[PDB]
Enzyme design. Structure first.
Site, PDB file in Angstrom:
ATOM      1  N   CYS A   1     -12.224 -26.445  71.312  1.00 26.38           N
ATOM      2  CA  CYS A   1     -12.236 -25.390  70.302  1.00 26.38           C
ATOM      3  C   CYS A   1     -12.076 -24.016  70.968  1.00 26.38           C
ATOM      4  O   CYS A   1     -10.960 -23.600  71.288  1.00 26.38           O
ATOM      5  CB  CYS A   1     -13.552 -25.450  69.508  1.00 26.38           C
ATOM      6  SG  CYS A   1     -13.620 -24.411  68.027  1.00 26.38           S
TER       7      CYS A   1
ATOM      8  N   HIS B   1     -12.752 -30.919  67.811  1.00 28.84           N
ATOM      9  CA  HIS B   1     -13.938 -31.333  68.546  1.00 28.84           C
ATOM     10  C   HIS B   1     -13.835 -32.837  68.756  1.00 28.84           C
ATOM     11  O   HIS B   1     -14.421 -33.622  68.004  1.00 28.84           O
ATOM     12  CB  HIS B   1     -15.217 -31.041  67.761  1.00 28.84           C
ATOM     13  CG  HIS B   1     -15.791 -29.682  68.007  1.00 28.84           C
ATOM     14  ND1 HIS B   1     -16.455 -29.352  69.169  1.00 28.84           N
ATOM     15  CD2 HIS B   1     -15.771 -28.560  67.252  1.00 28.84           C
ATOM     16  CE1 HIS B   1     -16.817 -28.083  69.121  1.00 28.84           C
ATOM     17  NE2 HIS B   1     -16.415 -27.580  67.967  1.00 28.84           N
TER      18      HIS B   1
ATOM     19  N   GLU C   1     -15.307 -34.719  70.710  1.00 31.33           N
ATOM     20  CA  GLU C   1     -16.594 -35.368  70.957  1.00 31.33           C
ATOM     21  C   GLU C   1     -17.137 -36.017  69.682  1.00 31.33           C
ATOM     22  O   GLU C   1     -17.810 -37.040  69.737  1.00 31.33           O
ATOM     23  CB  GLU C   1     -17.659 -34.384  71.462  1.00 31.33           C
ATOM     24  CG  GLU C   1     -17.184 -33.100  72.095  1.00 31.33           C
ATOM     25  CD  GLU C   1     -16.748 -32.069  71.091  1.00 31.33           C
ATOM     26  OE1 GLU C   1     -15.679 -32.256  70.498  1.00 31.33           O
ATOM     27  OE2 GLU C   1     -17.473 -31.075  70.887  1.00 31.33           O
TER      28      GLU C   1
END
Lengths: 506, 506, 506, 506
Positions: free
Chosen positions: C364, C481, C483
């Site tokens: 990001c 993102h 993750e």
């Protein structure tokens, strides 16, 4: 497996939980089960002897009057074990830890007091061979005095296993005329308090000024996590119809299924026939010498009698100058109950009933009063009295030596008025008194015409148990409280006889 | 007007409420007030005699060990009246209603049990002329055993009027390392439960694994309706500093103002000087024959002694074959405490301490053990024993006749080792034992060298109270429990003497 | 029939209920069931967007981080429907009554708010085809914010029928070192509060400083009306072992039987092998540019990666003058996470990682920072910046137009470093950002050597999604993102790749 | 300093708390204080518009009918701010957190919802310049919907300081005829629940089937920690006497002292004189076209009128074939109220009242009905109707365009029947309707004899506000609800006039 039905009360007391317990028990007996009832009174008093009437069981225990309801509905002799109190429980556990019986342990309310409570419940149920034991918890859910008892009964669910315990909760559903609406909030809150101590009631009984509509009943169910079919109304209605209507509503079937019992049509013939007699065939009015629950067993006895004589009995309460004729007009009988704080007025009524040939029945004090009366105006012993009301009387025809308690054997003298009523030579009757007819004056009283139709072998004794007069249409007195054994299925003879003569005098 | 400070506990017990009570009381004494402390133990046991150590008050009452804390912090003799239990209260009220003292009334928890509770609190405070009475409620707020006591103390607010009662509540503030955060929720809930029984605490004491930050303390205040200045931390820290730090935090001033008392700078010189001595000047290690709270007063006694001798005392716990030399190396004294279930091992230690001239002090059983030991290996009475551990011994030098309880007068024989320590001819010491030195063997024991340095006039007696030997540097034994009267302001001589010789032996 | 397992927490929060929920769900999946998890957050916030990390589901919902735990343990995409709040529920019901949808009825918490709660639970479970749905109630039992939710889940017992609902309760069992004793009182009280709202927990999980002994566990059972076999310990231990140990203790079998499911040996091979890898084979240390739960999914991603590369990953937290060399010594990689309040320091780290050929990964903001960095020192656009940190920059290479939320399609440019990691041409990744690479500067940046390895077709877009450099051993940045989709069973490629190069750089 | 008197209800609702609030407020005004009243309705409905009558305040808010009681007793215009609901509070706080106004904070019931509640209470009291604000909490203490409100008012004690807040609690004291005893248990439990949420009531008001004896009142005091002098009876009795008797009992003085206000003899002349008139001087019966609380303000209006005309008014409820003559015999007036689901029957009554010269008053729909009636049988517009009851009528004399709400200016045409009653040219009246007289048909109606005695300048309008006929003794209709502004101290003219003509027709 023994079944346990616990009945608790919420919102307010005095909603007729005793009758509810009694009625449920009878409904269970009408199904052929061996039943017993236990009253738990959370007060600190060890028993009811330091105290509404005090009922006396056959073993001499002085108990709450609910025991008398249970005996009458179950037609069963109960014992001290059927009336549990906070005092008994704590005293019992305390004395045990003083004797080191807890083996150096630190005794607490839980589990020591609670263990004691459950143990007493099971002990009595055992001795009484009960298949289903109905346990009524006194007081109102919420008050702290009931907490140890609520925790004890709660534990039974786990101890007894699935299908062997059921919890019923009686509450009030106020009715507000202004709004003309029923209020279920109190019931909701009371049930929430029950859940707070870990109990979820299985059945709810609703008591209100007016019968509770199914709409209101269905609402209560929705907000208490109780099945709609397990919510019943307990309306105001002859107490003998109570079990009938509860059965008609489904309370019998409900309890039956929740307990995992195959349905059994109940035989309610007795209760039906009983209420049947209760438009009568006649109607006699008798007078009771005195100034309500204080004479519960007494009044029930007259009720049983009226039934045996297919006749309704009205009761005029006469509170005892020579202005009796009025007080005793339109009456066919005089009854002086057990007792007190003033006796001359009754001594007067005994005198009157005796000279006007009015059926008379004296219980406990009522017998001693007739004796004081006879001794004075017939035996010529001026100032004759009981040392209880005049320790200095020159003629203590009633003296000393609640001392005699419970069942005591009474030997009925053959062919007497007392023999006609009992139709037997020997019976047991329950006592609760300290004063007796003085042995020394018995000879002289009979010489004057007083008949000793009963005495006791002792237990212990040899005392007078009953007196009468061959001479009036009916004049009887007993030292015991025969009302205590009176049951709707078996009226007490003295009262059956007393009511009969009252009908003849009519 | 008498002031009452009630201290309750929440979340979990064992957070040091006894010390808190003791410390607050001392802080109040340091302000010149006449103070007393009452421990309420909600268990059903009448007292602690059927039971951690059992403390014994001068009047012979067997009580919870907190009483001993109160005596040590207040330097005050308490009585059975200072330890209230559920059993006492219920038994008391029950016996009263059995004697009809309640005049036919129906006895309930409220107000009868509660009235009894408040009455006992006031009675003891009266007899003890207390200006401020600190009442500690045992148990945890919430459990049902404390309910009658919580309702009783709650009623004091109304009975005593404004400014005369204060409520303190001790709770736990868990600390979670993972999150590294303090949790105030339990405190919030506990306070809510207190409010549920009608009590709003005025002061909160927080106990946590780590000291409680003002941020957390201010949070607790916001969610408990308690002023921030009335929230304190109770960290883990020498118990003698406890009152010091609590005063430093403002707890003293807080209680003072809430009670409507003009501020008075407290004189905490003693406690300060006491902790001052507690880096010492020396350090001796003594052995205690045995296998923690079970020896609280014992250990405190050694503490007081160490202080009087400006020396720290380490305690090696020796549990009593001839492998003693090791078990007793690096030690300058042997103490056999009161007791049990096996005594030969101690009989061995007494033997050892005697032949190796190691300072010895036997309390209660410890004295009887030295006597059994002396009689055997010095008086030549093989198999000599107490009938408590061998009812068939041929030489019962210790026999019968917790029987002797509380203070008993002891007459110290002039110029003895026992006389040197007490420096007086007569004193009182507290007892709790049933076995005594057998009178018949006393002659023969002294002929062998055993000195009877004390006996009792009776109360009742004439029994041996203390023994010693002119021959070792220090060998003493007393039948009583001198530790019970030991206070930091006045160490018990036997222990002061015992610690001294231990220093000399060093 | 769908089964519901409700998990509540008592005493204090933060005891790992999220992991407990996740672990139980995984244990159920290992038995072949279709499972889903729902997190109930009682706060008034509609969602977590106005807010510990904020997890983002594929549908763009911003939620509590527990959702991310559930996704990782269940390897399942959840939605906004899996995170219920007080705000959502009330707002929903309020808007409905404003539209008259309740037909002139008076809307109350019960049943309107509660009906809404249960409806949402069932709705999501339906859409997700769940056979067993695990519902975790946030907050602590007792607080009033959870009451509507506790009443809602309580009602499920009756709605779903016997054998289809189970209630688990997680509590704290404090451990006091001084006394060295476990305290079960708080658990007892918490369970009593649960019963107060009408819930009796079926299973108890105990969390303490030390593992809870069976003795303590058996005590808790006795005082909570919970079967001993249904009381478990939740000790502190690799989070991946949690489900393993819970299964070993019997929690899996317990839940299974209580739900009326025939036992099914669970296949826990994955978790076992996972913990197996967790002694590794190697060990690289990477640096994260920043100042814990705030980067939960981030850290989990590195964890998954380390596993795929049979290597343990240490994390040095670098908080960004030219004193980097030190801050970046002994490190084989630099990661700039999404974000803030100051960016030059990171702009410095990007610069450093780029010139020293240190594996770099920007998420990001981390991507936008590398772009600002490239534009300045490579593209020669002095003062280049994002209008977020400098609205007046002459070269807004990052500008406008949490706007893009949830899954967005990303088109990977063939044969790029980004293509090697994903091995596919198109994938979805979750977004949560408002700033993007400015389209106008994209031409000039590539001319300087900046590679745009990914863009979006839109949804809507055409924006840059990823950047890299053919020139350093590993330099990657993505706008999304990644993750958030990373799962232990399927590590996120960017992190797998990042960890690999970190190993190569090692 | 502003004083706050909070009034809560327990056991059951509907015990007249609204009147209690109103009466206390009036008692305070009679002491010269600036007072205001706030009704808190815990339901989730934002207001009462989606819904007993819905009262309308001058600002157009639709509220619970208690507002109308407050306006009548305080002779004061209230606003939307005086009726607080759960929906308003939650919606308000939710929208604030959506706008990030809470600055990333996690919004909870406490303190966010509670802060909002107290803020609204203070805001309205400010705007209304209140010295003493009486806040009535709807619902019953215990239910969870009231919890946020109970916590909010509880916090006022601390916020406002000593002597500035007082808490009154209204409860039910059931009366059991069988036992002939009052039950205080419910009150005891309700007060205990209040204490559970942290509130101790200062004053108790007892409501029972029969007036509550001082003995029972003194008992309640003993078991609720409430001073005996602060326990009052709220018996069933003309609502106007309520404040009189409450003052006579001491409730006025009690509140006064507890608030720290020097006593001030109250001037209750109005209320006394009002009840004085309430044996009247005459007695006319009027008919209301309809099928109780639904017409509260309507009925109160007739009450006020009857008083102004020193005459009692009986109300026959006529539910509208040509069998009217009977339905309208012995009646001197016809009133068609606002409304529905069927209008022809009323159209018939309007017709009848018009041709038989029977005083007529149509409110809202009642006016539109007279117009439909006139248009048909006088204006010759067959099938004339409102598009509300016939969207296809060829003559929509009443059409569109609860839309107009609250006070709207009405211009009275000089020298009309409407002008005689108001005696002014312009006044404000409250509206709540969507249908109006169609502008297009106004010309033709007047040409037929229909008088438009009122219109509105707008706000916005130019619509007809009132109609009449120069030709019958009294025929009036208004679009607004004049009853809403009617107060016992200032009767509404239309009703005063209507009652007058009814007396003349008599």
């Amino acid at each position: 497996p023994r079944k346990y039905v616990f009945i608790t009360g919420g919102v307010v007391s005095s909603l007729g939980k005793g009758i509810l317990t009694s009625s449920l028990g009878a409904l269970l007996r009408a199904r052929g089960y061996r039943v017993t009832a236990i009253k738990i009174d959370p007060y600190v008093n060890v028993d009811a002897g330091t105290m509404g009437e005090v009922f006396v069981t056959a073993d001499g225990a002085e108990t709450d009057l609910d025991i008398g309801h249970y005996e009458r509905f179950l037609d069963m002799d109960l014992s001290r074990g059927n009336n549990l109190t906070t005092g008994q429980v704590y005293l019992s556990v305390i004395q045990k830890e003083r004797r080191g019986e807890y083996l150096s342990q630190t005794v607490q309310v839980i589990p020591h007091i609670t263990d004691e409570i459950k143990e007493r419940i099971r002990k009595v149920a055992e001795e009484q061979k009960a298949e289903i034991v109905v346990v009524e918890v006194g007081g109102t859910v919420g008050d702290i005095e009931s907490l140890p008892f609520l925790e004890a009964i709660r534990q039974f669910r786990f101890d007894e296993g699935e299908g062997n315990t059921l919890y019923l909760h009686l509450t009030l559903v106020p009715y507000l005329e202004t709004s003309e609406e029923f209020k279920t909030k109190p019931t909701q809150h009371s049930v929430a308090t029950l859940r707070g101590v870990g109990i979820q009631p299985d059945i709810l009984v609703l008591r209100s000024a007016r019968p509770v509509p199914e709409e209101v009943r269905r609402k209560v169910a929705l907000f208490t996590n109780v099945r709609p079919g397990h919510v019943f109304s307990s309306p105001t209605v002859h107490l003998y119809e109570v079990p009938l209507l509860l059965e008609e509503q489904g309370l019998g079937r409900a309890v039956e299924r929740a307990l995992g019992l195959e349905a059994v049509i109940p035989n309610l013939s007795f209760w039906q026939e009983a209420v049947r007699v209760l438009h009568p065939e006649r109607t006699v009015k008798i007078a009771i010498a005195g100034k309500p629950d204080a004479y519960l067993s007494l009044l029930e006895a007259l009720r049983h009698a009226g039934i045996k004589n297919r006749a309704r009995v009205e009761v005029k309460w006469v509170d005892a100058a020579a202005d009796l004729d009025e007080a005793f007009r339109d009456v066919s009988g005089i009854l002086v109950p057990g007792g007190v704080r003033g006796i001359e007025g009754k001594v007067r009524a005994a005198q009157y009933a005796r000279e006007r040939k009015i059926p008379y029945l004296g219980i406990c004090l009522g017998l001693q009063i007739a004796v004081i009366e006879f001794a004075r105006n017939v035996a010529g012993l001026k100032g004759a009295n009981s040392t209880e009301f005049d320790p200095h009387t020159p003629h203590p025809v009633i003296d000393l030596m609640t001392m005699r308690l419970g069942d005591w054997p009474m030997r009925i003298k053959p062919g007497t008025l007392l023999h006609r009523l009992y139709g037997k030579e020997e019976v047991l009757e329950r006592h609760r008194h300290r004063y007796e007819v003085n042995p020394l004056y018995v000879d002289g009283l009979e010489r004057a015409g007083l008949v000793v139709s009963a005495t006791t072998p002792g237990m212990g004794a040899g005392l007078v148990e009953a007196i009468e007069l061959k001479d009036h249409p009916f004049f009887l007195g007993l030292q015991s409280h025969p009302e205590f054994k009176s049951r709707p299925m078996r009226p007490s003879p003295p009262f059956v006889g007393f009511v009969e003569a009252a009908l003849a005098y009519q």
